Design an enzyme around this catalytic site. Structure first.
Site, PDB file in Angstrom:
ATOM      1  N   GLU C  46       0.878  -1.132   0.047  1.00  0.00           N
ATOM      2  CA  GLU C  46       0.146   0.006   0.015  1.00  0.00           C
ATOM      3  C   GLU C  46       0.860   1.336  -0.068  1.00  0.00           C
ATOM      4  OE1 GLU C  46      -2.407   1.778  -0.789  1.00  0.00           O
ATOM      5  OE2 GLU C  46      -4.251   1.670   0.846  1.00  0.00           O
ATOM      6  N   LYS C 128      -9.393   4.708  -4.525  1.00  0.00           N
ATOM      7  CA  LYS C 128      -9.918   4.372  -3.220  1.00  0.00           C
ATOM      8  C   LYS C 128     -11.290   4.844  -3.036  1.00  0.00           C
ATOM      9  CE  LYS C 128      -9.124   3.094   1.079  1.00  0.00           C
ATOM     10  NZ  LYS C 128      -7.915   3.192   1.765  1.00  0.00           N
ATOM     11  N   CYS C 162      -6.843  -2.123   1.423  1.00  0.00           N
ATOM     12  CA  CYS C 162      -7.157  -1.707   2.593  1.00  0.00           C
ATOM     13  C   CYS C 162      -8.602  -2.205   3.187  1.00  0.00           C
ATOM     14  CB  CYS C 162      -6.949  -0.316   2.760  1.00  0.00           C
ATOM     15  SG  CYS C 162      -6.990   0.647   4.011  1.00  0.00           S
TER      16      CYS C 162
END
Lengths: 317, 317, 317, 317, 317, 317
Positions: C46, C128, C162
């Site tokens: 990430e 995201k 995530c």
């Protein structure tokens, strides 16, 4: 409302039996000749496209199959040429046209009445509630949803047919919507005098009584044997007249089993005077009698937003 | 509408089991044969392309997982070599074709049948309703919007398979249309003459009863133990013939365990005589029972406004 | 479609904290090391360029402002020099590459995953969908039109990251695309074994747990007071391993603090076994539940027909 | 809202196989002993009346019919003696009870849960949204009108069965109703750990995970040949543990293969500390994804204006 | 539920034509002989009590009006000597009996069935839904209230007659009420092997079927001319059998064109073996199709509470 | 409730006889003068639109039919310009206004009373329960379903007219709904003062009484013979006054010969003093007497759910 004054007309005629294109061009010629006299509304007899089925009265219930085949190939349907040719004939003359036909949708076959407005559009249509003695062997059932009266330039129009005048429930149902000028179509064999005259007194409306005549072109093929031919000749003719709300005729009567037309002045403002004596759907009623009327379309199958499918073209593949 | 006259064929045949690339070539040879004799329509048995999964009946729920590879890697999808190769075979011969197959979309697997028109284009498809008893392990669930009938040069066409004839709901839903010529397909095991004959009487149509036969290509591969083999030989074989709307054969019957085709002339004009007695979606109905038929396509996830995407090519970078 | 077999690799590593020009070259050494062993796909942890913002939740909202100013001068852009040095590293090894970035667009800042093809070109990017509690004041919002799955030589690729694995709507959206292999990157602090292992069962894919390690320079940069420093040591460290669609590891486990690489064989043909038991977007569904998936791009302002402008050069005037 | 602080219990036991009249009485000694230790809520494993159909997983689609005949006579048939024997055991102790069983409607079987409260009446009912892998040929199917979430003295209540924890849309439907204490139950063959812990994290709720065991008296019934017995008895058993919203066990583990009970204190106010991070239907949402939820009750045949009949008798005679 | 065992009897017979007292006296003799042999359920053929109107379709619609005048005086009103004579013949033997007749009702006439309990009390009526092509002249139409199925020591009992088996909506309406043992009556002119065998499978029930024979005395009344007297010899004749829940006949067929009876042992728990494969209103359903069923009684005039009257006696005047 | 205080106005006037447009513009002007002085409620005499039918008293029932034809064409249809002009006049001044007129719905006329609220909307309508001695020739009866009282900013309001004060059952029904302020219109001829005053004592309400006056406009057209001309002058003049719960006037008199307007303060809080002595709907009664009050809306024909119908435009055809 306006309470207009005009002149209407009722036609006594016979179709070219079981032959639709000859029938629809004769219908077109009768509109073009009737409207030439300046009449604002024109009416036709029972089942005029293509013709009323006499073969159900003459033979036993196997005999009808030999002719039902020949009828079913000559019935009207809504997206057809017969509707377009009548819509031209109304648009060219600016008269309300009221006409009767056998119509096909789905697999079944029904008896209907159609109304065309002076702009050439189809206003709506009526279905017979239930079939009389012989014709139960041919036509399908009615519905309570489609039983209209129309607001128009010439007052509140509506209409019925045949033995619908024999039952009081439909008299009250029609009278509850404030009908003012009324057309009644009969085949010709039934005793059309008294039940027509009575409807005028019961509901205070001008009645255009309309009825057909026999010709050799049907009887020379409706029957296969001597017993059937002479038995056919036991049938009788019928009159056509315009009756006032008092119950006397306004017009002359079309004479002696011959094609023709009758017309008179209609002065609809005069209807008020006879609503002083009676109003069955109003003050002349009682608190312990009522009626239940339903106006909803309930076909056997109810589609819910039907949509088209996807096609793969031969170029794509 | 219009009432044509033509001759049609139905085939009793077996595929090259689980091997799609050979199976589609045998299909083209049967079209080029069946169309040689002048037939205007051709129809195949149940699950014809990869073959019907008999392994689901012979073993417990763990056994099928071994064979499911060979099935899933040989199922068709839209578009593919199978579609363009069958479309060539219809385009060359100018005949309607109905063919049944396992189709793959998303990750799931379904059963369908496909309709090809004489211009070589794909008219539409129908997907099985409920997946029987053993098939529930192998194939996915149906959808209600994918239940077409096609208006064509040869009247109104459509079809069904397996136990779809045992449920009154789909029978009435299909007869809500105006279907006239019908294809029904079966695998060999189910008892099928009674339900196909009843359907022809209830919904007046010519039914092309069609079914498949077993081969040693199955027997030597689909089982392993002695009692699995012994049990599999107990299944009976099928039939193929075509019936009138009277419920009697018009064709001959194909012999009970051999590859071959049956055909007859059909004259859809004749349906009207049997439409006289009853019409379940018309005049024989009663206003105490109705039906709801939702036709809105509802996949689990519905994409809105599909859009492509850009890339930064290595020459621009 | 087709079912390949290939070797894949997943990387446990850390950047040179908040410095981009060192960190891009560390990735070039580390990918030439990974690809030297013949692995066909490589994926990084990430926020690898330039680093994850641990400062956003050690201090109060005002403490962040002085560090944000130094992050914002080190984010990447689409045509940036930081892309050329990765695109050449893919071109020189002929492997698929997946890398995580912080992107600067229109003066705003986002988190993205970014993919490269063996020809060196950029396949596409993902944004995201929503920020978690540490991220909500550093990075901007997602979009629904930027959720791709790619058809490739090595099967259908995709990848969330995530906390996205806790939201069932994204599981359904990704599964609707028919993915087959799925990267999943975690920063290191969030508890990550159980949610990534459930995802493998829920959509039947291989998955590559990929995550970062803490280092000495990042804590010397970000702590200032003693009760920030000895508080930072509260955080758990991550690990990396790869799972089959059954939910057990196929790889070994990388040791739970040191820099390193794990790899295994992937045999995507094996996925068909598990689609027999369940498929949420196929047969294992109910007509009573659906999903609306809008897919059009709606930037806050939309340019139509973008064009340039003209200048009067000094020689002219 | 309410935060009630109480004690709840998970039960693992085997019903004596395919005998309703014995299993109903065995449930009473379990409820009375569990309630005698002060627990306010009690839960039971899969299909505890009369028993889960292990014979579906072994032998052919014919071999099961001789056992299905015996199962049909042992279904619960609500209302019945089997209902009132449980209802009184709730009223006599003032505990909430969840139990699961084969419900029978008309010709058909469904698998269902029944919920009772301290006043002894039914709170409501639940049914499967699809079958599993083997029993897909035994049980029927539910609808969106039979997925309630209740609210009462111990907070909000609900539950799901078997693989329903592995479909993303069922997690979303339940979380829309502000869930709090959740019952989940397993037949012991499938992997309960991963399927359950993720659901606890994704919902932030105590999960009352419950499981069955298979007794030696099953072996002498369900398997009639040696190889079938040696293919059986080669399965998992599941764990009946209690999980908190953090994903860590809050009770001891029950021994892996015995009758037994586990219980712990439940403190509903604890969930607020976790709903701060994420909320899949609250603040963690996005405008590009939604879900169409339809819960109109849809029986295949629906009665409306139900009426009663009468018998004529000897009054006149 | 209970699942009993019993012996059932199906009778083939002819009534004394258009002479009710003679036809009533024959029925008491035949019930006592059938019940003396140990049968517990006894059926009867179509329109049995006054006799079926063959004159309705040998002649044209004015020939039949001569004979309607005889039938109207021989119809059964409710209650009557005709009912009193049957009711005691049930009580004397403790057999359930089903019989068919023209029920006179006000001025109108309907075809109906009566069912009697072993106590002699009347269980309930049933009314014909729509008349078939020969008989639309004679009887009126029933409504959806008068279509019961009822629960009794024989298992669930119900009934249908004539062409009602040929339309799908009645099959579903009867099957929705959890059917078990069914009776069918046929006039003997229509071909009924297919329609009865398909119904047996399509609802999974023991079907008990019956029909009448012509008697040479009819041909002295029905046909008054030579061609009719010859044509009325050309008709088919009917069967009498009991069919199991898979289309195999249980009894022998009644072997000759004579009076006679068929017997079989019935064991209702055999039906569960077949309910496993398919259930049209249970698990074999789909969400996209349904059915609306209305049971509100609909007499044409719904007269509310009516009171008695007081007359002044001659002594008080 | 709130017990308000306000000024009220009672109007004595005559309309321009039988001219509806002249009557409604005269009414519109007379409100704009009455409201200019700040009164919050205004009330008109009986049948102000278009006028009271004095011709019914002067001649035999075949004379009336000559004038009925002109009254009918001037009746108030709803909605119409006669409603829009009064709704504008209320909206412009924010005073409650009460008016009475010959409405016309369906075929009959009815005498009615209409209430317009300060936002310009109709709050409700009332129909005269029973017609007077000569007046029975002209209008239909009312109904129990239309007998409102309105909760308002100025207390509980209702109203009655003409001989409705002579029958005690309507006094009791009106008092049962707790009316506080009351309007009582009269035509002018009937003896009124004593019968009006008694309502105040029996009901303890403020009563506004209002009457019309004779004019030359009617005298020179209602009659033509001397025998009628001088008989018509026999009728007594009217009065206009307002009374308190004391049975004694608070207003001045309007002079008996002329048009004019009367005013007073109304203080509704003063009613509870006189309601100490007697109120027949409360404590001043006994259980040996009771009243039945049915208020179901039962027109002669009751339409159920009804919508529009389909039309085919001339371009589509």
């Amino acid at each position: 409302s306006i309470y207009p004054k005009f002149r209407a007309a009722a036609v006594q005629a016979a179709p070219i039996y079981l032959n639709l294109e000859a029938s629809v061009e004769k219908s077109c010629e009768l509109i073009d000749e009737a409207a030439s006299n300046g009449a604002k509304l024109v009416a036709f007899p029972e089942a005029f496209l293509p013709g009323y089925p006499w073969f159900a009265f003459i033979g036993h219930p196997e005999y009808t199959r030999k002719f039902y085949h020949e009828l079913y190939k000559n019935a009207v349907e809504i997206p057809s040429l017969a509707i377009q040719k009548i819509s031209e004939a109304a648009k060219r003359n600016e008269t309300y046209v009221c006409i009767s036909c056998s119509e096909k949708d789905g697999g079944s076959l029904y008896l209907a009445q159609l109304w065309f407005n002076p702009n050439g559009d189809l206003i709506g249509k009526h279905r017979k509630m239930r079939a009389s003695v012989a014709e139960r062997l041919i036509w399908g059932d009615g519905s309570g949803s489609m039983m209209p009266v129309f607001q128009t330039e010439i007052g509140n129009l509506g209409g019925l047919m045949c033995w619908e005048h024999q039952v009081p429930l439909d008299l009250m149902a029609m009278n509850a919507q404030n009908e003012q000028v009324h057309v009644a179509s009969w085949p010709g064999y039934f005793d059309d005098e008294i039940s027509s005259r009575y409807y005028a007194i019961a509901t205070q409306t001008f009645v255009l009584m309309t009825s057909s005549i026999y010709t050799e072109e049907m009887k020379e093929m409706i029957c296969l044997t001597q017993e059937q031919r002479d038995y056919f000749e036991t049938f009788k003719s019928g009159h056509t007249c315009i009756y006032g709300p008092d119950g006397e005729p306004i017009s002359d009567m079309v004479p002696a089993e011959t094609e023709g037309i009758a017309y008179a002045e209609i002065d609809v403002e005069r209807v008020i005077d006879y609503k002083y004596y009676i109003d069955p759907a109003g003050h002349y009623s009682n608190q312990s009698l009522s009626m239940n009327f339903n106006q909803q379309p309930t076909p056997v199958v109810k589609h819910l937003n039907h949509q088209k499918n996807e096609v793969f073209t031969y170029e794509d593949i």
